């Protein structure tokens, strides 16, 4: 009941352990809306609560942290989520963001185009994705695992997420991917987190906490998404803005988490233990370089 004073509600472990069948999502509090503080955007509120929840986890927070944010633009041409992330992250954190459409951002670098065109030399400590296509809300069509940018995100995690890093990837009833759930089992811990300000939506953030680069746990992602919808269907979440009014403990603590480079042969149970506790990041510490593929075409005839 004290849930209304939390930033949101994470999917309880017992629901992760079920074997439910996929059903349609019918939220009792649909259409309900939280009362946002005067002049505050939904996305500022939503990202603030996401970050407040991430503050309760064992995130690795190194010096010279690297964070990349996908789906960061808005139909407004600005980047509210990026502004919250930059507020939350320690000053100096390297923040790159990206979106299909042009937008102006507070990130250190912004790449415009489909996410599949984004390449980076380096590995990242945290990956945030708000990517979404509202065309998936079609209730007249079967709800199958989606590909598109989810295929990119899965490969990007497996290829460019530092060991010890974390992710928060936006999903909904229809915007989801089975392999991404399966990949949640490659972290020390995972959940599906629902913000209290947007609790009338089937949106959640799939959070993978402290990447291990190998399966710790075998997850069937079709079943796990059915489990998520089952949870949402039977646990109405009361819309709430409360947590927005107390920002005194908002900043992410600069833990100075250690960064080492290591080869796959050196990752032993002791290293894996440190990774799982948020006390180690494994990646090169070189300069951060990114790029966007540009397709070249001459349409003159």
């Amino acid at each position: 009941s004290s849930q209304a004073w939390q930033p949101g509600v994470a999917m309880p472990n017992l629901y992760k352990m079920q074997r439910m069948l996929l059903e349609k999502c019918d939220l009792q509090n649909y259409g309900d809306s939280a009362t946002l503080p005067k002049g505050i955007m939904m996305n500022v509120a939503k990202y603030t609560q996401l970050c407040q929840y991430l503050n309760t986890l064992t995130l690795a927070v190194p010096y010279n942290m690297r964070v990349i944010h996908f789906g960061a633009g808005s139909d407004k041409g600005v980047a509210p989520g990026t502004a919250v992330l930059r507020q939350w992250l320690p000053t100096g954190t390297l923040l790159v963001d990206s979106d299909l459409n042009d937008f102006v951002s507070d990130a250190d670098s912004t790449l415009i185009g489909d996410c599949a065109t984004v390449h980076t030399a380096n590995k990242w400590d945290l990956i945030i994705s708000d990517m979404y296509d509202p065309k998936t809300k079609n209730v007249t069509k079967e709800n199958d695992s989606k590909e598109g940018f989810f295929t990119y995100i899965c490969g990007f995690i497996q290829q460019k997420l530092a060991l010890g890093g974390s992710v928060a990837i936006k999903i909904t009833e229809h915007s989801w991917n089975a392999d991404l759930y399966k990949l949640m089992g490659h972290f020390a811990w995972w959940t599906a987190f629902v913000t209290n300000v947007n609790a009338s939506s089937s949106e959640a953030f799939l959070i993978g906490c402290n990447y291990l680069g190998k399966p710790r746990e075998q997850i069937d992602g079709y079943v796990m998404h059915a489990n998520y919808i089952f949870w949402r269907n039977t646990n109405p979440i009361q819309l709430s803005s409360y947590s927005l009014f107390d920002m005194s403990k908002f900043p992410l603590k600069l833990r100075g988490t250690a960064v080492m480079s290591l080869k796959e042969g050196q990752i032993n149970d002791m290293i894996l233990s440190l990774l799982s506790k948020g006390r180690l990041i494994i990646r090169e510490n070189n300069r951060v370089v990114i790029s966007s593929d540009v397709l070249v075409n001459n349409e003159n005839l």
Binding site: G39, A79, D106, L244
Partner: protein, 116 residues
């Protein structure tokens, strides 16, 4: 010898009665901050709102070159504190006002250097 005067155009558009640029990104914060004008993290005091800087920059918002010869932006990547009374037009406010280079407060909205 020809350059567009976006600054002057916005000022005249405002004077003529146009609606201020909207969708400046207002931050949640304690509002117990230092009140300095432009900061690495929100610093609104009781009498200010804090906004993401890029969204309050006329040049950023209009997709035009910054008056800096290096083209560098004062606001992008930081947070700008706007007096609550002026929070209806953060782009106008940052355009029209200047930051005291000594104490970091807005001249005429917190800067007291010229009173001792």
């Amino acid at each position: 010898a020809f350059a567009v005067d976006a600054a002057k155009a916005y000022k005249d558009y405002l004077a003529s009665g146009g609606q201020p640029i909207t969708n400046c990104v207002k931050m949640l914060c304690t509002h117990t901050g230092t009140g300095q004008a432009i900061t690495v993290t929100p610093e609104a005091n009781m009498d200010q709102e804090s906004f993401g800087g890029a969204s309050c920059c006329l040049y950023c918002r209009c997709h035009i070159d910054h008056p800096n010869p290096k083209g560098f932006c004062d606001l992008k990547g930081k947070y700008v504190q706007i007096p609550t009374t002026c929070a209806n037009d953060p782009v106008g406010f940052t355009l029209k006002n200047t930051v005291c280079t000594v104490c970091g407060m807005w001249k005429g909205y917190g800067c007291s250097c010229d009173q001792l």
